[PDB]
Design a protein around this ligand. Structure first.
Ligand SMILES: [Mg+2]
Length: 279
């Protein structure tokens, strides 16, 4: 029920290129509980795994996913950038890694893996949620009960989650949150879904609880500064929410969130977290 979830952020993306099979093939090995997936929709309506809406940062191509067919996506090198960015981790095998489709991921792992899948605002990729729920259904990844689910769905978009919650009550949903300092150096939540972390209210969390089983807050801001506190975790737990902070790659930050009462973590290093869980 409150069992700790080791969530491999884009696979073991600290060891191999994110959202490639090179990265996904390490997750089971490194004892992760969930494989975290970001999805985009190609021009011919196929779901693929990629974080950005543009292919630029992680491939040798340029342009938006939505303007590209699955065929064009598939000729891109989605692995060489990693060898360049991280010379000390480079591998020849990473060269030429193709962008995975969500169906391919499901066909390869089936039920040996649990999936933690992110959606976007309904207006970004019209019909994405329905295509996603049909795919999940095709591979029997949705149980008819909430407890035996092989899938959680996560999103920054409350609208996207309320949509899914209306279609199927049996999928656990997680409300992602992003806290940052604004132009007046006041901390605000991106979507306006809660107060700043120091001042969250029961009501903030009870509202989330109407459609979601948990929250996923950023632990730090872009500067590297701590932005949530123990108080905040205590208030979310007391309202019966799971809490999955991102993106935790450092052992001391892992040990702190354990103590503060996180019930899961996004990490690029599922091996490090497993090790910290064993201490
Ligand atoms: Mg994500």
């Amino acid at each position: 029920k409150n069992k700790f979830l080791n969530i491999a952020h884009r696979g073991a993306s600290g060891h191999a290129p994110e959202h490639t099979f090179a990265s996904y093939d390490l997750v089971k090995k490194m004892k992760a509980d969930y494989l975290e997936l970001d999805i985009q929709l190609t021009k011919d309506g196929q779901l693929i795994a990629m974080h950005d809406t543009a292919v630029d940062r992680t491939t040798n191509g340029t342009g938006e996913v939505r303007d590209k067919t699955l065929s064009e996506i598939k000729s891109l090198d989605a692995g060489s950038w990693f060898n360049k960015a991280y010379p000390e981790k480079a591998k020849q095998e990473y060269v030429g890694q193709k962008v995975p489709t969500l169906e391919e991921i499901f066909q390869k792992y089936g039920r040996s893996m649990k999936y933690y899948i992110e959606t976007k605002s309904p207006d970004v990729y019209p019909g994405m949620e329905e295509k996603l729920l049909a795919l999940l259904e095709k591979y029997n990844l949705i149980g008819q009960n909430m407890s035996s689910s092989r899938v959680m769905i996560q999103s920054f978009s409350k609208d996207s989650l309320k949509k899914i919650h209306s279609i199927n009550k049996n999928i656990p949903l997680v409300q992602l949150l992003w806290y940052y300092p604004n132009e007046n150096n006041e901390i605000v939540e991106w979507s306006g879904i809660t107060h700043e972390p120091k001042r969250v209210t029961n009501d903030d969390f009870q509202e989330i609880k109407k459609y979601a089983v948990g929250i996923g807050p950023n632990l730090r801001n872009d500067n590297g500064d701590l932005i949530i506190n123990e108080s905040y975790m205590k208030m979310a737990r007391q309202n019966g929410l799971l809490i999955h902070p991102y993106t935790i790659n450092e052992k001391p930050d892992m040990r702190l969130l354990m103590k503060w009462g996180a019930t899961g973590m996004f990490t690029n290093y599922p091996d490090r977290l497993h090790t910290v869980l064993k201490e």
